[PDB]
């Protein structure tokens, strides 16, 4: 609300949001695998909805 | 054609159809607000129907 705005036209580009870690972080591999697990189990679609 | 693809791939709702018949019906029911890209053979056949 107040529902007074509107998205017009197609997207100007295509890209993605990613979980970011400092270059060389110990968490990089587990968090990359977790995002793929959450993707494959449908969690990311449920959370957007 | 690249400009047309850029538009079609991002158009909402989708401008793509599951079957030729679906595209033909969308043209027939859209009062000229929907044009369908299809093979000349199918186009020529439907033109005689």
Give the determination technique: cryo-EM
Tell me which DSSP letter residue B20 carries.
H
The answer for B 1-49 residues in CB contact with A (under 8 A) is 6-7, 9-12
User: Residue A33 is encoded by which pair of tokens?
Assistant: 């695998």
Task: State how far the Cα of B33 lies from the Cα of B26, in Å rounded to an integer.
Answer: 9
Interface of A with B (CB under 8 A): 9-11
Kindly write down the DSSP assignment for every residue of A7-34, as one continuous string: --S--S----------TT-TTHHHHHHH
Nearest CA in chain A to B14: A10
- The string over A3-39, giving b where at least 16 C-beta atoms fall within 10 Å of a residue's C-beta and e elsewhere, is eeeeeeeeeeeeeeeeeeeeeeeeeeeeeeeeeeeee
Interface test with B, best of A7, A9, A10, A11 (most B CBs within 10 A): A10
């Amino acid at each position: 609300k107040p529902c007074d705005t509107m998205k017009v036209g197609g997207n100007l580009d295509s890209k993605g949001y990613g979980i970011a870690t400092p270059k060389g972080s110990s968490l990089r591999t587990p968090v990359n695998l977790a995002v793929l697990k959450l993707s494959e189990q449908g969690v990311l679609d449920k959370l957007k909805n | 054609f690249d400009k047309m693809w850029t538009y079609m791939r991002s158009a909402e709702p989708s401008v793509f159809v599951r079957t030729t018949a679906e595209g033909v019906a969308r043209v027939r029911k859209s009062k000229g607000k929907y044009a369908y890209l299809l093979e000349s053979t199918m186009n020529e056949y439907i033109e005689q129907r």
